[PDB]
Amino acid sequence: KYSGRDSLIFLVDASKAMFESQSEDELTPFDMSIQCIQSVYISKIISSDRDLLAVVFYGTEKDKNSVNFKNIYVLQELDNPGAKRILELDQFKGQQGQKRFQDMMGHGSDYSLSEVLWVCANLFSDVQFKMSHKRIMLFTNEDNPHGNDSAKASRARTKAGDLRDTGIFLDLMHLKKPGGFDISLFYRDIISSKLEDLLRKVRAKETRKRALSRLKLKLNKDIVISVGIYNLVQKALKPPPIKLYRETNEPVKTKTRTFNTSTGGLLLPSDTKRSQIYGSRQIILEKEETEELKRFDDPGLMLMGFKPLVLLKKHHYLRPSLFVYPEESLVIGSSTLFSALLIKCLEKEVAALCRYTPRRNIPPYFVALVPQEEELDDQKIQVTPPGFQLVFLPFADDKRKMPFTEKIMATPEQVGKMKAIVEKLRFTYRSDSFENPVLQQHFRNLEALALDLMEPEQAVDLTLPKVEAMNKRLGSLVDEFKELVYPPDY
C-alpha cells in the first residue's frame, strides 16, 4: 500500500558469553550490538521517522513480557524513534554499563528457544496500523541452542515456519566469534557478517513515492488517454520551525485577523477590494476577477505535432523534468497505445510536443515529451524506467542576451597539456555522494541538542575538493601551464 510503514524488532542474545569479552580485550559483542542498534535508531529518527522500532533482549535473569514467560525481558515497545527511548538505550556501555545491565535485569539463565519468537509475534500482532515489511534482526553468535533436546529443535523449526507463512521474515547478523566467515552451519533454512550499513550509511534520506498529478493526454481533438506525472528530483529542504512558549514548552496556536476601519470593528472578507495603483490613479477589481484573468484551458496535455530528438537543444532549461506514465485507471487500453507510440517514436527518433496545464486554473505552458527506454541485466541495474520525459521549454522572456563583443584567440599548444591535466584528473564521476553540508551539520546539531552528548559532530565536507591529493597528484606541470605564454607579464 501507500501508507504501510516499515517495522523492525531488534532481538539481542544475552545468555552466556557475549556479556563477557569472549576472553579478549578489544570489544565485547554486546557493546557491538548496542552501538549498532543506537546507530540504526539515530539513522531512522530523521531518515524514516514514521516507522516502528522495538528492542528485546533475551536470556536475561529477570523477566517482563505480556505473555509471562520465564527469562524473556522486553525493553521498549513498537512506536516511533523517540529521543527519550534512545537516552534510555545508551546506558549499557562498557563495564559500568555491563554492571548496570546486571543490576537492572541480570544476565545468565537457562535460555529457552522459540517462545522468544512467540513474544515477537504477539508484539507484531497488537499494532493498530498497517505494516509493509516485518523484519526480525537477530544479533547473536552461536550455533546450537538446542544442543541436548531434539524436540526443542523440531519446535524451533515449526515456530519459525509459523512466522514464515504470515509474512514475518528474519535475518541474523551472525556475530563472528574469532572475526571471520567460519560457521557455514545449518541455519540457512531459518534465514531467508557485515555491519557497516547498520553502522553509518544512512545519515540523510527520506522515504516517499507520490504521483504529483493525474492528467489526460489528448491528441488535439477528441482522442483521450490517461497519464500520470511522477517526480524524480524534488530538491529537499530541512523541516521548518514550530513556535513555542518557553515557560512550559507548548505551542501557542497563532491566530491573525484584519480589523480597525480607523474606528474599531472587524471586516469579514466581503468588504475588501483588490487594488493596484499605477502612478496617480488606481485600478480596482474584485477577487473573482483578479483570479479569473488567468484562465486558458482545461487541465491536461494537448498534443501539437512531432519533432525529432535532435533539433531541441537540451541545454534550454528552467525547471526540472518530470516523468509520465500510462495508467489504466482513468481510461482503459492506454499502455497499448503508449507502448506502440513509444516504439515507433524510438525507431523513428521522434518526440512529441505538447501544451500543458497542470491544475484547474493555470495559464498554458509548452512542454516537449522526449522518449526513453529502459535497461536491465542479470544484476538488475536500473538507471532508466521505460517512459517519457517532459523537458520544459522557455517562451520568450526567459532568455537574456549577453553583450558578446570580445573575440581574441591564441596558439593551439595549451590544449595538449590541458588534456594531460584533465587525464590526470580523469575518473568515473559518481553514482551518489556529494551530500549537503548545511543540512547535514543541522542534522547533527539537532542530534547533539536532543541528546546533550558532547559537541557538534563536525560533518566531513565531501563537497570540498582534495587540494592536497590534487596538487602533488598533478605535480610540476602547473608552473609550465601557468608560464608557457600567459604569465600576467606585469
Partner: protein, 321 residues
C-alpha cells in the same frame, strides 16, 4: 548580472572570471494591494497577529515570550536562535573552484535540478585570464571532457556543485553551468516493464498505423536543397500569454469601469495553435486509429442558470368533414 569570481585549478591556477545568468522563470513585480470596500483606501485596514494558548480562552502570550523549536522524533526540541545561529555553517566567501572532471558522460539530460543556467564567460581588463580559459574550453570542446565546478553565491548562500560543458557556437564558446542533484535529492523507484507483456502486446497492424500517424504529423521538414532540417512551429520565440491577458484586462477596467470580463482574444489562440494543415493531413489516420483500436473506456455561474359544430365551421377551424 556580472557575477565575479576566480576560477582556480589546484591551488595556483588563478583565472579571473565573470558569469552571467540565463534562462530562468519569469513573473511580474506588482502584487495586489488589499483595500476596503466603499472607501477605497489602503490604510483603512490593519492586520494583527496574536498567539494565545490552548486554555479555556485566549490567555495570550507576547512577542517577548516565544522561542522556536523543531520536530525531532516524537517531541519538539527547544533552544531557538542563538543556538542555531552559533552552530551554523560558514561558506568562507564566494567559491568557484573545480572539484574534478569526467569523461564518460553519465552526466546526462535528465539530472539537472538547477532552476537557472549560468553562462560563465570570461573577464575584462587585459584578458590573460580569458585567453587562459579559452585554452581551457578549446581543450574541453574537442573531447567529451566535462568539468565539475563548486559554486556558491555568498556567505549567506548555500553550496553548489554543477556541470560545466563547453558550447557549440561560432561567435563565442563560453562555458555553461547547471547545478546538480545531491545524495538526498535523487529518489528513484521501480516502474514496470512493457516489452514482455502478455496482456498489453500491440498488433503490428496497430504499429504501422501509429507509424503512419507519425509520418502524417511531422512539424519540421528538410527543404531548400541545403539538406538540413528547418522547423515549423518553434516553441521558443512566442511571448508568454498570461501577462498579455493581464495587460489587456487591466486596460479594459481602466477604460470602461462598469463592463464585465472580456473573453480571450482570437489571435492569441491562433498564435498558441499550430498550422492546421497538419490537422487536415492527419484527419484520415486519426480516424483510422480510432476505428482500429478497441473500446477506450461545474462552475457556479454555470450550475445555477349539431349547431355547436356548425358555428365551429362558420367561425374558423381546420378542414371539413
Amino acid at each position: 548580472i556580472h557575477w565575479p569570481c576566480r576560477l582556480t585549478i589546484g591551488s595556483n591556477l588563478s583565472i579571473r572570471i565573470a558569469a552571467y545568468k540565463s534562462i530562468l522563470q519569469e513573473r511580474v513585480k506588482k502584487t495586489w494591494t488589499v483595500v476596503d470596500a466603499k472607501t477605497l483606501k489602503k490604510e483603512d485596514i490593519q492586520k494583527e497577529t496574536v498567539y494565545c494558548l490552548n486554555d479555556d480562552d485566549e490567555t495570550e502570550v507576547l512577542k517577548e515570550d516565544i522561542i522556536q523549536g523543531f520536530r525531532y522524533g516524537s517531541d519538539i526540541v527547544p533552544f531557538s536562535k542563538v543556538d542555531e545561529e552559533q552552530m551554523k555553517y560558514k561558506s568562507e566567501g564566494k567559491c568557484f573552484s573545480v572539484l574534478g572532471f569526467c569523461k564518460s558522460s553519465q552526466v546526462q539530460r535528465r539530472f539537472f535540478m538547477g532552476n537557472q543556467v549560468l553562462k560563465v564567460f570570461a573577464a575584462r581588463d587585459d584578458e590573460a585570464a580569458a585567453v587562459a580559459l579559452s585554452s581551457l574550453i578549446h581543450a574541453l570542446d574537442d573531447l567529451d571532457m566535462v568539468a565539475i565546478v563548486r559554486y556558491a553565491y555568498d556567505k549567506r548562500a548555500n553550496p553548489q556543485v554543477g556541470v560545466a560543458f563547453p558550447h557549440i557556437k561560432h561567435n563565442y564558446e563560453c562555458l555553461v553551468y547547471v547545478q546538480l542533484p545531491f545524495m538526498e535529492d535523487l529518489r528513484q523507484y521501480m516502474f514496470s516493464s512493457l516489452k514482455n507483456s502478455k496482456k498489453y502486446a500491440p498488433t503490428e497492424a496497430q504499429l504501422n498505423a501509429v507509424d503512419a500517424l507519425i509520418d502524417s504529423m511531422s512539424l519540421a521538414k528538410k527543404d531548400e536543397k541545403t539538406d538540413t532540417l528547418e522547423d515549423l512551429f518553434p516553441t521558443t520565440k512566442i511571448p508568454n500569454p498570461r501577462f498579455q491577458r493581464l495587460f489587456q484586462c487591466l486596460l479594459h477596467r481602466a477604460l470602461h469601469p462598469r463592463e464585465p470580463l472580456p473573453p480571450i482574444q482570437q489571435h492569441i489562440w491562433n498564435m498558441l495553435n499550430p498550422p492546421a494543415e497538419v490537422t487536415t493531413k492527419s484527419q484520415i489516420p486519426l480516424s483510422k486509429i480510432k476505428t482500429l483500436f478497441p473500446l477506450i473506456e461545474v462552475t457556479a455561474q454555470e450550475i445555477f442558470q349539431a349547431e355547436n359544430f356548425r358555428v365551429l365551421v362558420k367561425q374558423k377551424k381546420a378542414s371539413f368533414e
